[PDB]
Amino acid sequence: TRVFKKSSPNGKLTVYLGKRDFVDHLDKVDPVDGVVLVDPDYLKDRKVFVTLTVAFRYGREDCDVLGLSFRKDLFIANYQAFPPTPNPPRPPTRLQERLLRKLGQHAHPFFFTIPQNLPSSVTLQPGPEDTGKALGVDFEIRAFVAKSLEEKSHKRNSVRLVIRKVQFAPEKPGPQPSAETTRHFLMSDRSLHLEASLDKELYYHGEPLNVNVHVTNNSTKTVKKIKVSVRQYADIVLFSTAQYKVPVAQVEQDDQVSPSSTFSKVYTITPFLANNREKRGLALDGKLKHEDTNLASSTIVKEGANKEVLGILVSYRVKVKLVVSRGGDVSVELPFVLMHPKPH
């Protein structure tokens, strides 16, 4: 196969990284592994270090003249690449050994473990009203050579590379997502009973969703309109709990449910980005540099609920709103996930 590479502007420092996309198995994540190439006489007294910093970065990095990132650091780690340290953790890996064989003596192994309590690559969509890129949690691997950890940063020394942490669907489907609502009235014994059921609890992007909705209007009021929409909730946690809920796809039908009657139907709704290019606050999956992508992949939580809230959390929900005449509006809400399948 191949190995992605990045080199310092000076050309004396180069870092080889085994992979660009890292995945988790809900119990352990594939370790970050790579090698760094450098010729010893360039430093001859300095030391080589690598850093994996995850930041709540705002804006962009192309020297934009605007209020730049609130650069809250979520989690940072360090490792002495050179001079060599004790062998752990634990040996050089198969890719590490292969790169050492390919290059020789000027390669240096560095290892990293991503804690399970970390967010997933998410990026908010930049609004046309503002300028440049927008905020969003992101990973970054930075290898620098210097005498001390706190020594001043140098462009020729530091090399910057971006990685992503994304999740993949478990092969075990979950319970059927369904809900019900029985709405009585202020005094009358007549009521309003409705049913909602879903095809599945897991879906792939672009794949249409068929909601099964049924109404039992054994009452006297009139149903004017039926509103069907899919809502997105984005739990943002920096030091305070917050969420910017926003709809993404809405479909309507001018269907009238008569009193003392029952009505059921199947509706098709699809979450897609083509019609929501401008809505600020939409959540997109992590980009490499600036390339487009799908909507934000739903992030499943671990079995142990712990806290797990140290970044951006995204979830999807579908709500169907029944417009009943002269008041009594009632809606039904239901959760589901939406994210990629397991590749090969």
Partner: peptide
């Protein structure tokens, strides 16, 4: 820039 290199099959 980001590029690729070689790697050999062991």
């Amino acid at each position: 820039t980001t590029a690729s290199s070689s790697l050999a099959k062991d």
